[PDB]
Amino acid sequence: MAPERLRSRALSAFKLRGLLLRGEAIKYLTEALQSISELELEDKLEKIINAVEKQPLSSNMIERSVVEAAVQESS
């Protein structure tokens, strides 16, 4: 369990909801979730997605500025 596997797990959680995630944004939450339990990573990141779903946006492409505020509700 390392960032190179975390990235694939984390991108898939946004893809399952119909979103896409920027390279600066995937890195941001990859560092924020670096030590989270491998079987809880999806349930944890789902709290970020639930915050993105109530933030102002205009595309399915999520960005670092959106995640940097969505993580605050997941904390």
Swiss-Prot record:
Membrane-spanning regions, if any?
Answer: none
As for subcellular location, the record says: Nucleus
Q: Which family does it belong to?
A: Belongs to the DNA polymerase epsilon subunit B family.
Q: How does it assemble?
A: Component of the DNA polymerase epsilon complex consisting of four subunits: the catalytic subunit POLE and the accessory subunits POLE2, POLE3 and POLE4.
Note from the entry: In eukaryotes there are five DNA polymerases: alpha, beta, gamma, delta, and epsilon which are responsible for different reactions of DNA synthesis.
The protein's job, in short, is: Accessory component of the DNA polymerase epsilon complex. Participates in DNA repair and in chromosomal DNA replication.
Q: What is this protein called?
A: DNA polymerase epsilon subunit 2
The organism is Homo sapiens
Q: Which residues of the full protein are shown?
A: 1 to 75 of 527
